[PDB]
Design a protein around this ligand. Structure first.
Ligand SMILES: [Ca+2]
Ligand SMILES: [Ca+2]
Ligand SMILES: [Ca+2]
Ligand SMILES: [Ca+2]
Ligand SMILES: [Ca+2]
Lengths: 338, 338, 338, 338, 338
């Protein structure tokens, strides 16, 4: 994503006036193809009408242009497009919050799994690596950036997210469905094995660890649900037919007619319709935002930084349960004692 | 459902332009009947007006067409239809999330119910089969696809979801209401019987299993509530009268009149109203999406894949508590040790 | 409620076309009075204008009709009415989900309260009867159907929901406020008395039972809040003044004037305004849905089936803690063993 | 609040027609001042125009009235006002549900704090009085009705909500901020002191009591947040400038011009603009509802009955933990035994 | 923020009429620059047109002004701007509720961590200082006011929020990412160290403290998510291009033309367009509210008072676990005893 929050804290004058001077993740980069196609088609029809057509053929084109200008308002562009964009934005922010963060499981495993020797160290690192793997295996199914980072499971083995013994156990488990739920069972079995060996003191701490595991499992299930149940295809087809049909009508209807014929409405000849191009800018770019945000896990400039987030979660998770287990600062008095 | 999420990750040019070349679950398959009925009625009235009516009768039809063109805008089509479609889409996504997933109960039963012999194996499989049966018995009441897969309870017995002794116990329980709550009591009684025999260690683990049982029971209750309390019938009647009355008016009002009579507005004769057919496309198809999604558990192309989900839940549930109980990979060091 | 979900699973052709042939809970049954009053007033003014008024008086009525037709669009009908109907529908579905279901408490009491003799049987039945009574005493305060089923507390005694000793204890408790919270204290005291006698094993199971009791108490409190804090009366007055003032203006403005006077707009005389009657149909019926759903606990055709739900909850609750305590089917192998 | 829910259960004919015959909490009581000011200003300008101005001055007033009638539609009244009213209603119902109800803490304290002697009786009453005081001290900060009931802390002492020793301890605690969090710490300390003396059996019951304490603390924190973070003042200024500027324009633009001058639009002279007064009624009263509901804790007719609710909570809380501790009815058989 | 809730409790007459006489946090302070730029540009173009241009050049400017007045309505200002402002307000109130409040952790630590000597006092103060530091370290990353209060970590050391030993431990932990999660691991490790020394009695109280820690960690994670995932930049660019392009068109289109030329629409010459300036006021100020509230953690007049809240949380947290540990008032009888 493009983050500009620190630039818009106060509202002086050019709070939004400077942000339109940015190229990375802009409206200009999105509309740079469709806008130039629209410019090319409009100026092509304009030059053909001004330089090629005969007089009766121009007189027929005038009636066609008046018909298309009168009756292009029957197409419900804003009515369909606002509803579709509201769906896309609602599902967008709903899909951000479904991304699993390891930090609650991190806080519980960093303190409740005892042992300062190598066995408890290995145990805590294996628990957090299972919690991260149960996230990576669903993020490589819902995202294309993670899938291009990890094309096969051997790339998950080489990155250190999975040992080859876990790869052999993962391949030996026979299931035709998506196997993202495999480490979230290994986590619970390893937590119970840790409790039975005395590394976890009581049942309440074990049940807290398992509750946070099931919370992360619900997060991964929400990601699977938002990826599998898309926006219905019939909505996408209706909105693209709406925008493309409206501006296909505006290719003919918004053409500058002859001022010497003295039509009502077409009195000035400017050869560049500023308001038609602005209306195409707002409607077509308003559709392009929904095209960008309908899948926020791809490789757009404003899709989610999933690979960075995987690297952060792996580093922070393996940091807080290895170096920070019983490594506390010295309990000292504050500036407010007596 | 038709899933196209992997095709719309990035937004290059034809992100939505290729998706209108798809037939399965499209606007075209929905409107293929109503659109051709509208085309047939319009061209029938057009040919009758052009070839059959006498001159005074055509002059009366002209006044009828001008009246219907002037006063068809009084019908609040968009105002009623947007509100109705917003209800349908909100209830649609609310009904997806109410579908019970066994995975939290799966994670707890796979680890907390002890025993590697045949008795604990039978116990875990019976617990997960009760948790799946308490979902199947409500999905065959809210869906028509599951009801056509399982027409009677004997088909539930033959699929392995229920043993015949459980069928006899299920028939001996006398209740005139829906019996989907029967396995969700058997689960709690079998969990307490498992705790009393020592298969579950403490009370906290038992209460966690019962809390996830009650969570799945709340999911099934939400499905029962959304199926039983429909959208009010008066809304459905008002929206279908709105769309059908508006286009019944547009059968007469949008007719191309005679250009030689020189009416204001009807100057060009094209014999095919492109914008009337587009307006019928958007409004009527916008109603057809609500017709499709008012019950997302039927057998439309974009209703929910409930039978696939039942098969997945049964296979994954009986997999993770039988093969994956204490079958863990070897605890080995990572690529980040020292 | 009228349930039609099983009829609209697929979307073939007449998915909504058959549902307008139904009378029970329709738009026709709602508007059958107001629509005929509007028809009567319009045709009365029409016949008086056509047969009674003199020429200068008709000429004054023409100017009054043109004024009322020009200036009835200043009344914000859709703007106020859409906001009001959105409130009514949001509160409608929010009030359905606040109805207490005994099933979570049923699942916990059916398994955690021990004893196969008559004392534990009496104990479980008394606990579930308290949980049902704490729901009946708020449903007879928020609904008129339950209040007509149970006019006094003696009718609650005769139905078996309350023994006469509990009636005497309920009357001896002195409080000027609504006493729906009385059985939800008796439940907690009886659960603690059951724990102290050894019928409940540990504290965790008791706390789970009390947590589900407090969940049902929050459900009853939400019902009390939605009944006591209505939609503000000023909104109801503004919407009824809006609809009635707009169609009081349309009684005069939509009248067919004389075509021989040649007014702009009034050229055709049909004597039955189809689009005025349709506009009255949609706006007035859109108000009548809000009139129906502003209190969904009354005795409309599409209000909630509260009495049926009370009977179901009583039967299922006293069934699952009496016959189904330790009555489990035989643990047998599945079709997938080895 | 004005409650009319029992009057609108069914929808016969006059379901909303009788509710406009009510004065308490009506649109008429709100608009009785602003409407008469608008009537006075309009009729003043009308009589001055009809009786005082000369002919050229009337001819200038005609052009001013046509300008103001043509260009008053540029003011976005409905666009700003609908958004503002939606915020006010959303925050209104969000602030009702944040009002703390003592009933969950009541159910736990009435059963889990042991002792039938005077010490446990005093202990339970002191716990519930702390839970009520932690609500009263935030309701006298967010409401003006509670602040006029309790102007100082001595009025809280005289009402029995606080003993004078608790008043001295409350004054000895030095903090420049709002002290509504003081009894919600006393509750937890007294619950731990009750557990350490054996009045509470185990830790799980104590943690349940503390969890419901923190739930009530979150309710009080939501009330503090909704009172402290208002709707932004810039929205309130924009909506009042919108409504007042639009009807300041309509004082001149809606004036009946001279019919003998024969302007397009002003042909009939009625001297009382019915639709202008109706439009002022709906827009200005639609603003007055937001003025009423922007602070629903004041002393309007449809603000919340906070003092009644404080009296109810105090009476019910001190009732259910004193008289109803181990005072249960006799366990007797039902009408459905065998 | 500017709080005016106590001024708008009742609705008499001038409930909103007095609030437009306030300068701090008003629409006037926001629009004081852009409005004067618009006034300057409009009056500059007006004086140039009235005093400088020749007759044919004025005749060309008339056609340009009629074109820009006819075709500036094609720009979807309200359609884009309402959607954007709805996003800004929804995210605004969603970001207020994500601010962590220490009070639940305060209530649990003030009672469950035993010890009246200096060691338990130091232990409770260190726990609450960790809970406050885990909030300060994310509020100095999401806000500019806290970042200007604490430019470096030495300023956090000097304020008493962090001892220098904790500063050395905080710098020794090597991580390239944001370190706001560091004290929320120290809290859990210190709570487990407090439990193992006997300062916390059982496991249930420890798990309650850790659950409230993870709740505060989820609050800080929501703040990090709302700061990192902004509103998409393409929406901000489209709305600022919409407002600026519409009023750039209105600089030419709303100009008062010559009345002697007798154009339809431009008949009166007033030299100050009141309704154009009002329309600029509402649209441009409606954009400026979104500019103010897109980052509510900056230093605007109506952004959140974050520094005051940090000071309050520090004072109240270190107050309630030091002075109020076992300092209870005397248990005395109420006014309602017998
Ligand atoms: Ca994307
Ligand atoms: Ca369907
Ligand atoms: Ca009703
Ligand atoms: Ca108020
Ligand atoms: Ca700001």
């Amino acid at each position: 994503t493009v983050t500009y929050t620190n630039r818009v804290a106060d509202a002086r004058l050019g709070t939004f006036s400077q942000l339109l001077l940015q190229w990375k993740g802009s409206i200009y980069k999105l509309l740079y193809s469709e806008f130039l196609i629209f410019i090319s088609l409009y100026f092509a029809i304009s030059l053909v009408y001004r330089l090629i057509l005969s007089e009766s053929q121009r007189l027929m084109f005038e009636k066609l242009a008046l018909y298309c200008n009168s009756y292009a308002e029957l197409i419900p562009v804003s009515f369909v497009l606002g509803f579709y964009v509201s769906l896309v934005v609602s599902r967008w922010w709903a899909q951000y919050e479904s991304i699993p963060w390891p930090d609650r499981i991190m806080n519980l495993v960093s303190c409740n799994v005892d042992g300062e020797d190598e066995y408890g160290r290995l145990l805590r690192r294996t628990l957090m690596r299972y919690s991260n793997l149960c996230s990576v295996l669903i993020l490589r199914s819902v995202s294309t950036a993670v899938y291009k980072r990890f094309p096969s499971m051997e790339h998950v083995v080489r990155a250190g997210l999975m040992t080859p013994e876990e790869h052999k156990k993962f391949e030996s488990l026979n299931s035709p469905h998506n196997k993202f739920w495999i480490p979230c069972v290994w986590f619970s079995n390893l937590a119970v094995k840790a409790r039975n060996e005395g590394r976890i003191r009581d049942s309440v701490l074990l049940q807290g660890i398992l509750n946070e595991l099931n919370t992360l499992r619900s997060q991964c299930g929400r990601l699977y649900g938002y990826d599998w149940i898309s926006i219905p295809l019939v909505y996408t087809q209706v909105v693209t037919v709406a925008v493309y049909s409206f501006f296909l009508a505006c290719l003919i209807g918004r053409q500058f007619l002859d001022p010497e014929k003295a039509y009502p409405g077409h009195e000035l000849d400017l050869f560049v319709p500023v308001f038609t191009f602005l209306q195409f800018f707002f409607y077509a770019g308003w559709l392009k935002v929904a095209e960008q945000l309908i899948n926020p896990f791809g490789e757009d400039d404003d899709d989610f930084e999933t690979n960075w987030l995987i690297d952060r979660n792996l580093q922070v998770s393996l940091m807080a349960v290895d170096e920070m287990h019983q490594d506390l600062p010295i309990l000292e008095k504050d500036l407010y004692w007596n």
